[PDB]
Amino acid sequence: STELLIRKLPFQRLVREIAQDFKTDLRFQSAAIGALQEASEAYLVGLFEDTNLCAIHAKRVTIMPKDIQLARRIRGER
């Protein structure tokens, strides 16, 4: 069962909490939450791959927040 990344129920409740700050009384299609979860997990896994490469370039095995920040800057995020 190494297919598991973020559990579905907490992810769904996270999405709905965030959405409330933009519009009240929304419902979601099940596939809308699923697509958001797929995109979020693909984003985070890829960021961890890139972060890992940054750490390795720094001759380290332990990734640190500065590795995440460097990866995001190389990726053009911020």
Binding site: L53, A71, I74
Partner: protein, 33 residues
């Protein structure tokens, strides 16, 4: 060096964008009119 690190991440990001394009096309094929 840093140039190699930069090229590898940018190359991965290009592939990831194509994977996302493909995923969104599959979503359109299933859910779009």
């Amino acid at each position: 060096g840093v140039d190699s690190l930069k090229a590898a991440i940018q190359s991965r990001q290009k592939d990831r964008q194509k994977e996302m394009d493909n995923f969104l096309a599959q979503m359109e094929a299933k859910y779009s009119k």
